[PDB]
Amino acid sequence: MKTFEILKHLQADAIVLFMKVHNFHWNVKGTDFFNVHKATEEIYEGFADMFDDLAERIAQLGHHPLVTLSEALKLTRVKEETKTSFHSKDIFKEILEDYKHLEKEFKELSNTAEKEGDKVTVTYADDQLAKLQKSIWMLQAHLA
Amino acid sequence: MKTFEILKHLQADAIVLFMKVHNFHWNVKGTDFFNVHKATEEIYEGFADMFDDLAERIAQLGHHPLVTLSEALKLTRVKEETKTSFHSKDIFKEILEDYKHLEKEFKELSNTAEKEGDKVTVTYADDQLAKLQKSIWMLQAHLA
Amino acid sequence: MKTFEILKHLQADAIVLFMKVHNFHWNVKGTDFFNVHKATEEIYEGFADMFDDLAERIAQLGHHPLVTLSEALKLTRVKEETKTSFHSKDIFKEILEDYKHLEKEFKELSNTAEKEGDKVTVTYADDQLAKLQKSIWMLQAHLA
Amino acid sequence: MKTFEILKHLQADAIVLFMKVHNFHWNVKGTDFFNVHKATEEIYEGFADMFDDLAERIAQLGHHPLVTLSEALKLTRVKEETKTSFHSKDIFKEILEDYKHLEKEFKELSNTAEKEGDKVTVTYADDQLAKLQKSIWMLQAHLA
Amino acid sequence: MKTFEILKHLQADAIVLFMKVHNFHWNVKGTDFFNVHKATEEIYEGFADMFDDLAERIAQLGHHPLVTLSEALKLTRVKEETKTSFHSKDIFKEILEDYKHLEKEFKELSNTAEKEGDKVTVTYADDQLAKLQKSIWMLQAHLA
Amino acid sequence: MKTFEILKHLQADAIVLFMKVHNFHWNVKGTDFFNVHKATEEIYEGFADMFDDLAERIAQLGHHPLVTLSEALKLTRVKEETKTSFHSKDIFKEILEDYKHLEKEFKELSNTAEKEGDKVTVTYADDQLAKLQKSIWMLQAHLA
Amino acid sequence: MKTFEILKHLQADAIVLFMKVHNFHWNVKGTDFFNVHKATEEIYEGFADMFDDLAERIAQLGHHPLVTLSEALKLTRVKEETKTSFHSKDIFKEILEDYKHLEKEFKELSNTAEKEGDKVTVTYADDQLAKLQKSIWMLQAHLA
Amino acid sequence: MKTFEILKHLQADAIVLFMKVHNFHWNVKGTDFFNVHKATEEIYEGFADMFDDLAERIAQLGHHPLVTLSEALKLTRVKEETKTSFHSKDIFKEILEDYKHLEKEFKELSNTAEKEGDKVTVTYADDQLAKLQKSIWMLQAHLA
Amino acid sequence: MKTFEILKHLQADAIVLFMKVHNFHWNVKGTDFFNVHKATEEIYEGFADMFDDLAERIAQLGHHPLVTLSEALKLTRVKEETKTSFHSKDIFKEILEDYKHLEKEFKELSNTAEKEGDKVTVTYADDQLAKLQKSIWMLQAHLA
Amino acid sequence: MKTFEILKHLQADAIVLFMKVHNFHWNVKGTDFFNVHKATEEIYEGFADMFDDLAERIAQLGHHPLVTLSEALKLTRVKEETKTSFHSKDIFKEILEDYKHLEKEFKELSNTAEKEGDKVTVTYADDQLAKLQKSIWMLQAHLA
Amino acid sequence: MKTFEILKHLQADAIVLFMKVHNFHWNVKGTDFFNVHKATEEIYEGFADMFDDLAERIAQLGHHPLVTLSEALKLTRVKEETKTSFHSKDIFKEILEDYKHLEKEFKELSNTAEKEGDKVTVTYADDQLAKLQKSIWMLQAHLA
Amino acid sequence: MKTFEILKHLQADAIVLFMKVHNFHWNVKGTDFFNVHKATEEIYEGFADMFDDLAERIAQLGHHPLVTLSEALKLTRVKEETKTSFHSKDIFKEILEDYKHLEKEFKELSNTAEKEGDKVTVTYADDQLAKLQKSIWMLQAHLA
Ligand SMILES: [Fe+3]
Ligand SMILES: [Fe+3]
Ligand SMILES: [Fe+3]
Ligand SMILES: [Fe+3]
Ligand SMILES: [Fe+3]
Ligand SMILES: [Fe+3]
Ligand SMILES: [Fe+3]
Numbered sequence A, B, C, D, E, F, G, H, I, J, K, L: 001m002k003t004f005e006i007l008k009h010l011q012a013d014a015i016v017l018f019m020k021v022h023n024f025h026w027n028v029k030g031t032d033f034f035n036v037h038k039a040t041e042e043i044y045e046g047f048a049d050m051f052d053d054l055a056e057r058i059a060q061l062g063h064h065p066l067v068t069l070s071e072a073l074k075l076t077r078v079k080e081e082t083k084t085s086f087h088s089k090d091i092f093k094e095i096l097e098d099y100k101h102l103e104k105e106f107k108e109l110s111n112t113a114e115k116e117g118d119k120v121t122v123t124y125a126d127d128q129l130a131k132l133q134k135s136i137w138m139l140q141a142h143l144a
């Protein structure tokens, strides 16, 4: 699996997670509501940035980003969430597991782009790893 | 078709159009590139607001917003765009036709919510009509 | 009961609730203290805006707003709170019930002002309903 | 008289009042000069917004806004002011009477647009009524 | 009369004056309307800060602030104003006399808190005296 | 023709051009719509500043600015535009010719005010020439 | 009297007027107190800028600005004000007469600097004339 | 123990608490993570201000602030925390006890500086007491 | 010498020092020019604040501030500086000695206002001491 | 060719391109004038940053940046543009080819600095590649 | 030598001085490093503004600005600096002499543009003289 | 020595240098006082950021940051400074040598993290090297 393919799969994961976290946003229950509600807004606004970043990296490489939701659904490795009620504990557990998935995928992006001498994608992959590793650390602490 | 059903169909249209306009964003060609590129960013940021607005209106009404992309695709009336190259003329024509569709749908939202005495949804529907009518006017002028 | 009378009763409720929520502000206990303390500040600052809005709507209609606390106490439908210690759960339950009361009263304001052809008051009533319905939704979620 | 006709007459009134209030701006006498001078600036900047708002509402409806001063003068119901010296009392009396005129005209705009099912114009008419009713209240108080 | 008692009486005066000055705000007549209207807004926003400051000082001392309007009315030394029409001269005279009252009361707060070694309350009392003495000076000049 | 007369004729031209450019604003057609629409807004906001500047210069000189639209129409040298549809090319050509006219008139203002020793008007005339010469240069480039 | 001499006399007038207007600031009586108090602050902050501007112009010319109050008093043409109570009418009359004096002096600065080919001082003199002529116009209107 | 000695001991406590609270910052566990994490950042940024304030007060008095960590450790009365995992409850209890300690020490600073006639240090001590008393109140409420 | 007398003498010192430091501002020589030039601007802007503060404190006490430069010169204890060339070393030495003078005078203000029970003036005196003691410390370091 | 040599050649290219793009800025013709004019300003402001960045990287490495235009002209690989009239199409083609050149040169900077273990220059080279690749993508789209 | 020729020679001087001052920026030695480094940045950012100003003035006059570095070098009267190490004293001396040169050249620009009746260029020349005369004054003081 | 060990030693160096530079801050002597005083504040605010950055990197790696000053003192390689008086020359020499030390240590962090495939730490190490290399360059210039 080569660089543009990894990016396209990640673009698909970003839009799917943009959606899944909106679900958490709307359907969180319990007294720390304002907190989760606030934090989920910042998270899905991050996914939409990731989505746009990945797409423009694909274009700059000479390839076509994904341009439909059905292609997103075809290419994603993320399970969509159908439940409609959550406490902060359940939401943080879900987001953690997805963060861990993305962390593995950005690690492969980094390593594969290095093998092809694509320095700009390495730098981009390494910047996302830094953000993911920090969020994973924080979420791991929420659950302890 | 009752108020929450109309809202849910519109929520589905917003996410699908959020995606379609990203396509225009990435794939516009020609010398007014910066202009289109800039304008499409403002448009899909509007769809994501519309998406979140509609969802929270659905929740406040006691119902569940849509929480998956496959439900978006099931409920939408919008055709997804598979082409990957455009000039500003082609993009503006597409966006106009979709604006006209939404304008009809928000008109039905307004009228149906009035029949049920749902004043808050009327006000919301009427605010979106004002924005749509202004954008339609402007787009109609781009194409003249 | 006619438009200016409904407004005056609501003006009385706003000042009384401005006070009741200060009580919650000062007397909240437990580890989410900063959260409640912050949120109550935003709530009673909203009541004081509501108080000033209702008063100036009364004046514009040709009538006198209420100008004393004893008239507030005479006209209010809100029970004053004498307790001086609370957790976030108790505070959110109280505020919800009062929000529901105001929501019924703004609904009557809307309907009565429509019967008299007072469009400006309808618009104002409908704007407050939108805010109340959103806050009710959120508070209902805090308690689930 | 139908919706676009009422709007066009109002567009004509806005430009004429934009001018009349500049006259007050320049020609106010007495020790509260800074006050009037300041307030008239805010008033004619409001008329120019009203002028541009009405024009773009006319365009969105499929019709042509007025595009010349002589058409403004043909269609206006406002008497132009030829005097060149005033105290604050004289200025506030003039502006009040014109505000009352506009308030009647926006009331007809609201009612006529309702009869045609033009929701966006109703909302716009109702927003201007709210501003006019507040300014009328204040000006009525200046003169008491 | 000991420190917390003086504070509680002052808390009662602040809410009562918050109300009385709203009356001036709404019911001022004459050509300097914008001025009074503006100044009264800044004054009652000061009383609400004073109200919240005094309450939190009471809490920090281990005691309960007042939490109802009827307790405000029981403890206040301020006469509520029932009239509903004023010129700037009448309003400034009223506010001056109330400022003088508060100045005497904050002087006693300062002296009593010194006798108990309550340095934080002294500093707070002395800060309010500085504000009151400046406002008294200015109001005394309005009336000369 | 003496200084105050030249200023008054220019005041008349500014209001007439304020109007003519609103026409361009509303009635521009073609794909660079956002651009023209944006630029015309900045242009007529400049004319309204010019209008107010000229008027206050007239007042400071001891004379009366023009205070009616019919006096504007009597004194102007600008032809009002009755057409209601344009491309950017047609709009820029129109605005250029009017800029050239104003440039000649501000040159006469400068020279005549110098002959009377009116230094403040010279400085003002010279500042407007600088702005006009820059805009003329730019518009001349649009059409090449 | 040559350029640096005119500047030095003006520097002396600026500091003396800085002081005289502080007197007005502190000692104004009557209900428009806030207005005068505000306006005098802006006026003496202008004199202190004028003072610093004139001084640095003197230095740039190779000469020494005045560096003591007694030299200010020796060189000034302004009468110091010993009274300690005023209404807005008395204050505006005083400031007008001093503005007229400065206007004559800046006119001589302009003409003398022209005779010596000192373009920078001309430009500076002409900028102060513009400010003075505008303030004179406004003050003349306060007194009508 | 004289004024500069009390200040130096407090400087030592501030740096030690700056460190201890970083520990809480990094090692907090549980779902209100964002809250604690946020609040601890604001707390240790306060200690570093206190540290710099105390040091510059010592210098202004003619003495040397502490300039090494080992001198901090020699002079501090605060126990360093070696544990590396906490919930919000444990953190708030720790911070409260340290706040109470500092409150006693600033009380002695105030009283000792009064005995020496050092007014600036009294004012500084009294300002820190106000902040400490407010934070103690809030923390006491977190634990109820 | 009683409180208002001490204040009036200090008002006289502030205006005289405002002037003396302008001299330093204009006439500093050497390579750290920008530094001194910058710092002197901040210093004389402080004196003008001190001047206005002292004056309004005098007024609030029922007395007349000084309103002429000749009264400033009569009452000041500060020697005016006639030299017109300095290095940073000479300027800092001068400013230090004047700071020390003011520090003694504000100490007497504090002590005398305490004897009369004038708490607001004490607080004001103590705030100026804090600023003076900090500046003295810094200037003493410049010269070491 | 070693790291400092590559940097110095790039410094020479940046100043030469800073100049060439000013030419485009001034001499662009056609109706999208504002667009090009705006974009060229942002481009040559980027070259001047690149120029200063490269120079300070050279200095930090122990070597001398280029300090004359004739050394710029000696070392540059960029052809200077002598034509003085362009449409947006011609300008974008020119800038693209130069962007491609710089992209090759920054790729060599990256690879050579890696061979010498100069991590800071690699990071800097990789950051410029990211910017260049994005601009190349966009310009390539302008021309399609 | 006529107006456009003088401007073009000055454009050449601005780019050459932009470069020479970058040299000072990078190569200043000694403890006031931050100061020089800061000041040189502000100076060469001024030259680049001067460069762009002169160029656009040339274009507005109907002529071609210089568009290559070799034309800059051909037309300049400024000696390029080849040294690569300086103290603040050496840098300020260099910049002063170049400021004096530009001051003579802008004086000729002013006088020649007056002879041709080119008012806009006079105003521009006179504005640059004001800036140059102020900087010359300051630099002359650095060296005393 | 492995990655987390290098980070922990650096965390210890950051807190120790945070302290040492406070010493320079407080105890600098001579006329460029404001400069050093300002620069040291920016430097120790950088160390506290470095301290917090290193700590959170340690936590994200699964290890415990240092949480006591005595552990800082145990692990540091930096000599604490006991002197209490300095000129800018002495301070800059000290800070340079410590910057050089940190530069060697961040180089080892980079190389060791590369050997373990820890990309996020490499990126972080390389970002600190860039800052250190720039500061070293500047400090080296201060001392030349
Ligand atoms: Fe994008
Ligand atoms: Fe939301
Ligand atoms: Fe209000
Ligand atoms: Fe518009
Ligand atoms: Fe609305
Ligand atoms: Fe509060
Ligand atoms: Fe105006």
Ligand SMILES: [Fe+3]
Pocket (backbone or CB within 6 Å): F123, G123, K123
């Ligand atoms: Fe000018």
Ligand SMILES: [Fe+3]
Pocket (backbone or CB within 6 Å): G052, G056, I025, I041
């Ligand atoms: Fe200055």
Ligand SMILES: [Fe+3]
Pocket (backbone or CB within 6 Å): H052, H056, L025, L041
């Ligand atoms: Fe400090």
Ligand SMILES: [Fe+3]
Pocket (backbone or CB within 6 Å): E123, H123, I123
């Ligand atoms: Fe204080």
Ligand SMILES: [Fe+3]
Pocket (backbone or CB within 6 Å): G025, G041, I052, I056
């Ligand atoms: Fe004042």
Ligand SMILES: [Fe+3]
Pocket (backbone or CB within 6 Å): J052, J056, K025, K041
């Ligand atoms: Fe730089």
Ligand SMILES: [Fe+3]
Pocket (backbone or CB within 6 Å): J025, J041, K052, K056
């Ligand atoms: Fe430009």
Ligand SMILES: [Fe+3]
Pocket (backbone or CB within 6 Å): H025, H041, L052, L056
């Ligand atoms: Fe942190």
Ligand SMILES: [Fe+3]
Pocket (backbone or CB within 6 Å): A123, J123, L123
């Ligand atoms: Fe990076």
